[PDB]
Structure 1
């Protein structure tokens, strides 16, 4: 029931299999103690990873353990630089938690037979420990630098009347925990449309640099003063937009009744801070 976490195991034994139904997104920013927990690991499908034990037949709920293991060139072992974090049951957290030790923190949720021996891991975050605080403590040789990829490790301990314990362990896909690269400045050099009717609706191509899938295009309007009086996002064709070409659908101007052209601006923004200098566009009366 407390088998060493460094001891190797298998995901399947006889008719018993421990499987990860829903995997986690390949990216999760681990949080530090000096900052507010950054939530629980999520699934690529905007949900949560799912784990399930199949061949179980008894009616007594087992205990699923969760911990963070390595993801390097060596066989999986618990990660010394990250620790699972009990994403304190808020509103999304449904699966009851429970923390244990063993020099490695490990959670433990239950695998109820009524829940077909499958659980929704929505109560497990990833805390990042400080290298300096770890390295060379309790006998070490491992180093944290560049060791920022991990795996969610799961395991169950099935008891058999024959006095036998079946221990299954399943590791998730590698997860990247370091903060992702920051947004560069999107730059707009050319544009294939300078104006169109108030209805908007046409496609515009922005020739530039540093465009991405997260690139956004905002259309605004200034008063002679500087008071921005209009903001409208323009739909980007992610299916066509490239790093140096951004396809954008010109929005419908805020007022179709104008009888005189009206100058406006629009910028490309990466993330929520990296915008390009305002650009020019004109809307014509119908």
Structure 2
């Protein structure tokens, strides 16, 4: 529905936001999986002020993230994952030019709902812009927001319709960047703390040290553990790794980079090791 709503006398809140990224899939591919949450779980929606003992139907559809008139995204449609097992929530498929998922919000769970039945299909830019009426374009526009709605019936006969939107979700298959290093060196034993000040640093970021021969033959590689804290979206706390040879009589130049998965390595950062 293009009309905007909010959170009237009660309140519909997203208790658990979905990961910032989520590669969507095409009709040409097979499901690319449900929208997952950073916690390794799934996003969670909850209706608070409801006291009655009647189950409502939470509605889920994919909407726009940028611009600003929250509306169904023309190039994305929620996908009903048929989790023969993994699925913890029942589903239903409706329409209105855009597909909508309806999951039950039951008081049994304190009107709380785990969303692990929602995927993200991606229609083909051409196929869309090709239909009479649409003026928006797909190109470069792949940000999305999960939209949740509930239609609360009050004994008085009225219908209160709340709605909420997740944070933005990138839906396309963005690398790390280091600007400053808390420390520049340390000695063989390691231990000392190094705080990296940069960008794109996510909870899934990794830091690895490496040493190469003047040619390029990497002879050393070791992952230095990041930190227990949520760190920061632009700050990492790395515990300098130990070295492979404490018995050095001259400092040793090495490198360390930040990586986010596979094809996501930051430029090599310089770091030296002083002999005992």
8 Å contact kept, 2:64–2:73: yes
Task: List alignment gaps of at least 5 residues for structure 1.
Answer: 1-6
Q: Which moved more, 1:168-177 or 1:118-127?
A: 168-177
Task: List alignment gaps of at least 5 residues for structure 2.
Answer: none
CA offset at residue 225 of structure 1? 14
What is aligned with 1:92?
86
Within 2, Cα distance between the matches of 1:189 and 1:166? 50
Within 2, Cα distance between the matches of 1:96 and 1:216? 37
User: Over the residues paired in the alignment, what is the CA RMSD in angstroms?
Assistant: 5.3
8 Å contact kept, 1:159–1:165: yes
Q: Secondary structure at the match of 2:127?
A: helix
Q: Which moved more, 1:230-239 or 1:23-32?
A: 230-239
CA offset at residue 64 of structure 1? 1.0
8 Å contact kept, 1:64–1:108: yes
Q: Does 1:53 align with 2:47?
A: yes
Q: Which moved more, 1:262-271 or 1:83-92?
A: 262-271
Which of 186, 195, 200 is the matching residue for 1:205?
195
Distance 1:87 1:132, change over 3 A: same
Q: Which moved more, 1:274-283 or 1:61-70?
A: 274-283
CA offset at residue 63 of structure 1? 1.1
Q: Aligned pair count?
A: 276
Within 1, Cα distance between the matches of 2:75 and 2:152? 29
Within 2, Cα distance between the matches of 1:240 and 1:101? 39
> TM-score normalized by structure 1?
0.66
CA offset at residue 65 of structure 1? 1.1
Within 1, Cα distance between the matches of 2:167 and 2:7? 21
Within 2, Cα distance between the matches of 1:190 and 1:145? 35
8 Å contact kept, 1:93–1:123: yes
CA offset at residue 280 of structure 1? 10
| Deviation string, structure 1 residues 207-228 (Cα, Å, up to 9, x no partner) | 9999999875545689999998
8 Å contact kept, 2:185–2:272: yes
Within 1, Cα distance between the matches of 2:181 and 2:45? 49
Higher Cα radius of gyration: 1
CA offset at residue 79 of structure 1? 1.3
CA offset at residue 251 of structure 1? 2.6
> TM-score normalized by structure 2?
0.68
Distance 1:125 1:254, change over 3 A: same
Distance 1:23 1:264, change over 3 A: closer
Distance 1:163 1:90, change over 3 A: same
8 Å contact kept, 1:13–1:166: no
Distance 1:138 1:115, change over 3 A: farther
Within 2, Cα distance between the matches of 1:51 and 1:257? 57
| Deviation string, structure 1 residues 6-41 (Cα, Å, up to 9, x no partner) | x45565676443332333344433233334433322
8 Å contact kept, 2:203–2:230: no
Q: Does 1:145 align with 2:135?
A: no
Distance 1:158 1:275, change over 3 A: closer
Within 2, Cα distance between the matches of 1:167 and 1:247? 44
What is aligned with 1:71?
65
Q: Secondary structure at the match of 1:114?
A: helix
8 Å contact kept, 2:16–2:43: yes
Within 1, Cα distance between the matches of 2:151 and 2:178? 58
Distance 1:201 1:135, change over 3 A: same
CA offset at residue 239 of structure 1? 11
Distance 1:37 1:279, change over 3 A: same
8 Å contact kept, 2:142–2:170: yes
Which of 105, 113, 118 is the matching residue for 1:119?
113
What is aligned with 1:9?
3
